[PDB]
Symmetry: D2
Subunit: 269 residues, 4 copies
């Protein structure tokens, strides 16, 4: 409780449940003296899950499909209403693939499903920032963050069209980082996070834990790092893809990972 | 004339005119002993230019919208009929942004325009590979190349949504490289080619900018058996640009600009 | 003044004068509630410059050639004495090239001078960390930072053998990051900083200012960012080369840089 | 046999035995119509193995400690005498760590050992290029390659100070690439080659690990005129390893390891 975000206002997407990273950013950002507004889809809100978080953080849950420019124009107006003007930061934490959910392989994509994957997981970020820019919703030296994963750089079996969506997301962070930065000094970055619970499940989380010298970064560790990016101490950090993974991105082989791999290869013999 | 591609068969997208990289790849690939099939839009073919290349390369041009799975299915069928079965290599050299054409700023995109940008410039690559995979069109140890640009990594003002499309294209090369590679050992790579920006890149690059002729020669290596273990790479072909922070030549021009200010 | 480094102890190398980045990290780290020890060469101290900073921050200036394992073993003992035990963080900010100073070009190196360049600018970092590790000088979840520059990745005319030294420095951060991390969860990173005053002079600082949407990062901006890395909020950030450059690393061409370049190319005609 | 290097002349360091990449580069380079000169340490030559390669390649082996500027001066003189003037390409394939040989952990390095590691594995590359530049030994549009490994970017437990030496080697390629390129248009690149680690890399890489034969073929492309605009690059030649996060094959082996635990 350093009061890092004292007198700072933000919008957080993608708080579903207590386990979700955007949920932890929300409750941890207020803890640091921030006012926030929450958003998710009606089918996400109606369940009644996020409302509980929007009790804790005081503040409101504004319904919006983040792929709908209309829903985003409403979201920004209702967000700016609630704060009584501009805000400082925004957390984008959205992404799913109908290709993954319908069990299509990467060499058997449905291209309507792919358009949805790219729209929900990446273009939504551009849409959210463009609506904000047009309504001048964000103060000078504000901070926009989107969550990403290293499949954007290095292919992960079964992660499918989400890898390509994360690459597109990270590029939008650069492209829009330049425009918003040269104009109003607003910084835009991606945090490339460890695989986190709720093919990003059991065996992969063990591999990444063992490979990473500091182990996997928790959702709480992620929330911790993101606060730094919303603080004035990261003002000159923009257009970056920041690995938050206990060193995973910088590792070829750990002794601990090889010890497991060698057993898989040798144990029987 | 090394006969690098003797006995090899190729499909080439994006040959428009004599200045096109894809055009130079087609004529160099035939010089190196490859058989090829050309493809572009019906409208491109109708303008009469690509027919000149098909005659020189002793082959056919098959009309296809590369964003249309149906057209790509027809194309792969006609290509395999022309060759009498499977082929070895494929060049994707397509890309266009309606947002750029209409002079839209990056913070005033049309999202229907952006959909077209991504589809023509990136998803068209996935579509062509997936149709080829389903028809088993490509021989084991085949080679697929798409052309890209460093805006995929580093922002160029005014390159607009094409930067994001290139980032997506390069990711498709990796995603599909893994899938096509593990089975049939087909390699998939992007060549990040050279492009006032032209003058800046020329002076920044110790060897100067790569020409379309230069790029054609480099792509031949990737279709050759000599690059069989090179896959899922984004290969800078730019006379050193991607590895430069500042050259003497580029700094001298910039300094003169600071003094005229 | 968030009290980020409340009850935290560190060692800072390379404070020469008020303009120097390690000087600003020192005075800014105490401001955030840290105790520090200062070090430089006798010829740096004797001038009497750093002593003034070691008045402001209370604490001592311990003389040490950071290329001498003997001087470093003394430094760590005297540092741990002064704190009455282990410390938490360490700032490495050392580097020069006799090749640069004697005006030799990269294709006319003196190889004794190169050994010195690599030793002062990179191997010194390994030496400092190895001495610390052998004396268990650093608490669990401690943070080691070395300052670097993008010439490590992208060649800069006239920057000479320093580019190769920065590449070697950044690699040591990874190599030692893994060892110190898997054992005692100590994180190790490099901050790749903007060109900063005291070929990293006038025309280059203008180019980097114009190219970077947020302009060059100051020594004060750098000190700000480094505090985040010493804080508990970056615990899972290790083996990273972190660009702090107003977006330089992520830029191909800004409108503002091209406006200057086009004048250089066209103005006369 | 493409005659890729017809009329070209090369100097090759690091050929020890039939299994060496440098050995395979020498014999493939001659097959492709190059003339070469071989170099290794006096002690290496005395063991009798490399003389077999010099006979096959119809050439000489010149003794040189590649860390000795004096020996490199003698080598470049003898090479240029053998060829009757300038040559086109050079392969650096040297590297050894006394710290690794003596089983020193990375947090217990000997700094005299580390000096030797850096000198043999990295600075030797600068030394050879600088001596070649001063004697103007290399033709315009020549090609210099050194062999590297991805430990330069991503940490492998037990690869030790060799990881840092590879990071330094790759930086020298860029630093010297710019200087040699701007004048004489000589390209300088590193090839980041494949290497239980061998099994892990084989299963992670969609195409499997690159062999020394594979690497020789790829290096031929970099000595050929077809790669003239490729410089200051670190080129992964690894069947896709550098672009992989996790493969099905690698994950299956790892899963079996988790269950045996």
């Amino acid at each position: 409780a350093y009061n890092l975000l004292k007198g700072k206002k933000g919008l957080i997407f993608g708080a579903l449940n207590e386990q979700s990273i955007a949920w932890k950013v929300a409750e941890r950002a207020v803890e640091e003296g921030a006012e926030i507004v929450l958003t998710n889809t009606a089918v996400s809100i109606r369940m009644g899950t996020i409302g509980r978080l929007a009790e804790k953080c005081n503040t409101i849950v504004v319904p919006a499909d983040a792929t709908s420019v209309e829903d985003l124009e409403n979201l920004i107006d209702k967000t700016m209403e609630h704060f009584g003007g501009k805000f400082d930061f925004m957390l984008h934490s959205i992404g799913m693939s109908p290709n993954v959910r319908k069990g299509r392989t990467y060499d058997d994509l449905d291209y309507d499903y792919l358009s949805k994957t790219l729209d929900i997981s990446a273009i939504s970020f551009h849409k959210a920032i463009q609506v904000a820019r047009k309504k001048d919703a964000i103060n000078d030296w504000g901070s926009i963050v989107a969550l990403s994963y290293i499949a954007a750089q290095r292919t992960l079996y079964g992660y499918n069209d989400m890898a390509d969506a994360k690459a597109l997301l990270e590029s939008i962070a650069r492209s829009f980082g330049y425009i918003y930065g040269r104009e109003k000094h607003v910084r835009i970055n991606t945090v490339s996070q460890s695989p986190t619970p709720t093919l990003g499940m059991g065996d992969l989380m063990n591999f990444a834990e063992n490979m990473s010298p500091l182990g996997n970064a928790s959702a709480n560790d992620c929330a911790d790092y993101v606060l730094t990016l919303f603080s004035d101490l990261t003002r000159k950090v923009t257009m970056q893809n920041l690995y938050h993974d206990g060193g995973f991105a910088s590792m070829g082989m750990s002794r601990r990972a090889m010890k497991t791999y060698e057993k898989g290869m040798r144990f029987e013999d």
